[PDB]
Design a protein around this ligand. Structure first.
Ligand SMILES: N[C@@H](CCC(=O)N[C@@H](CS[C@H]1C(=O)c2sccc2N(Cc2ccc(F)cc2)S1(=O)=O)C(=O)NCC(=O)O)C(=O)O
Ligand SMILES: N[C@@H](CCC(=O)N[C@@H](CS[C@H]1C(=O)c2sccc2N(Cc2ccc(F)cc2)S1(=O)=O)C(=O)NCC(=O)O)C(=O)O
Lengths: 225, 219
């Protein structure tokens, strides 16, 4: 049976899976779970994923509840022997290490910021606090890109797919003017045909966040090429 | 070159790596980075790990900056053919999924709570809020244990090592009496020879958090 992806394209980790699905031309059934309406708490989805989170993948008997596991699973089954999830051990561990950076550091801090907007309203958020936290993530990614051309090495990997969706979401708010390597990398990612799968959900996220938070992202921040 | 582990054993993700090292009898060189003194911001360590986090593993030219990658790396290098990191794809994906649950959900919420204590002081923390968030993690793990003796199946895996160190840290504040599968599992984990690697740092974390937070854990 072909994979089933429970999704809300506003979510960066969902969009990372959408990019991989487009990149590898995987046939996947899409099942929308509207996070704005709380559909992740629907009884059947909750029993499927007690974390009530998207993306969730059902592929046969396998149920994955984290984008980073979904990316690895889909790469092993549809990019077998390929370079997105590289064959050599050290290269693969480097990709895994950056996937975990996305979970542990980048997405955690972006989610922290957007959760404060939803709960308090943008005018009541300590924006300077979150600017510091997320600029710190910019600094770290700039350092990674000072030593390699893509995030995890000389070529595109799963790490770039995971990170670029959250980047583009952070960059709705915070400009990349002071980060030339990260701007060059982001521009290169935007030229990829697979990046088309990030565009619609990023814009839907912008619309929803501006509505719920009663604010506007500064239009000048987002890198657009 | 033998692996080098930069560590502060107060940290649950550090303790998971220490448990695996004891389980597999891995010869490592330990290097203490005192987080209480801010030594993770020392110039050479930031150069090595710009996330200024422990655990950090240096193994030859490979530098790993996340406990979950370190667990997988060490299992693949030192436990080929073991059950901790299963060879079968579906089983391996299940372990990976639970390792990411630990990063994304359990440790995130435990770190949220302990960071509130450090920044605000225990007397000013919304304990009820964090009790709800962490009890939600208990509920999820209790469901994970419905069909299996361990988190990822019938056998001990890397997922149990990652989860149990954070468990025991959450359990310093919130008891497990309402979660029979989870309490059974934790008692069984505590009986492992390798669980001794968790003991020292858990107590050091209790002592340090109680001083920095100016409080005492109920346990
Ligand atoms: N490691 C896991 C992470 C999976 C996960 O957490 N998925 C959630 C959606 S991602 C998300 C988020 O956390 C927050 S907090 C505030 C705003 C947002 N997001 C924007 C958003 C706003 C409004 C809206 F209607 C939709 C989205 S977000 O960036 O999308 C998730 O499913 N949350 C549901 C829940 O109940 O927790 C991994 O897969 O990698
Ligand atoms: N996914 C990564 C996570 C790696 C990581 O974040 N490691 C940190 C130590 S774990 C840690 C923690 O996050 C917090 S927040 C508040 C309290 C604590 N900890 C307790 C503590 C208190 C006082 C003290 F002196 C030491 C510890 S904690 O549980 O130890 C880390 O290195 N932080 C340093 C930094 O600058 O960020 C993975 O590896 O899995």
């Amino acid at each position: 049976p072909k994979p089933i992806l429970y999704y809300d394209e506003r979510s960066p980790p969902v969009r990372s899976c959408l990019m991989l699905i487009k990149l590898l031309d995987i046939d996947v059934e899409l099942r929308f779970v509207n996070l704005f309406k709380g559909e992740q708490f629907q009884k059947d989805f909750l029993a499927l994923n007690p974390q009530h989170s998207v993306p969730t993948l059902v592929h046969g008997d396998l149920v994955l509840t984290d984008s980073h596991a979904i990316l690895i699973h889909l790469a092993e089954k549809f990019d077998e022997g390929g370079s997105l999830w590289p064959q050599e051990h050290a290269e693969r561990m480097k990709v895994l290490n950056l996937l975990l950076f996305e979970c542990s550091f980048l997405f955690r801090r972006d989610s922290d910021f957007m959760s404060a907007i939803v709960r308090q309203g943008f005018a009541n958020v300590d924006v300077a606090h979150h600017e510091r936290k997320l600029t710190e993530a910019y600094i770290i990614m700039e350092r990674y890109l000072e030593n390699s051309d893509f995030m995890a090495g000389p070529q595109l990997t799963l790490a770039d797919l995971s990170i670029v969706t959250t980047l583009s979401t952070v960059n709705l708010m915070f400009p990349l003017s002071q980060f030339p390597r990260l701007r060059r990398w982001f521009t290169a990612m935007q030229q990829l045909d697979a990046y088309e799968a990030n565009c619609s959900g990023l814009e839907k996220l912008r619309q929803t966040m501006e509505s719920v938070g009663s604010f506007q992202f500064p239009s000048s921040s987002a890198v657009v090429t």
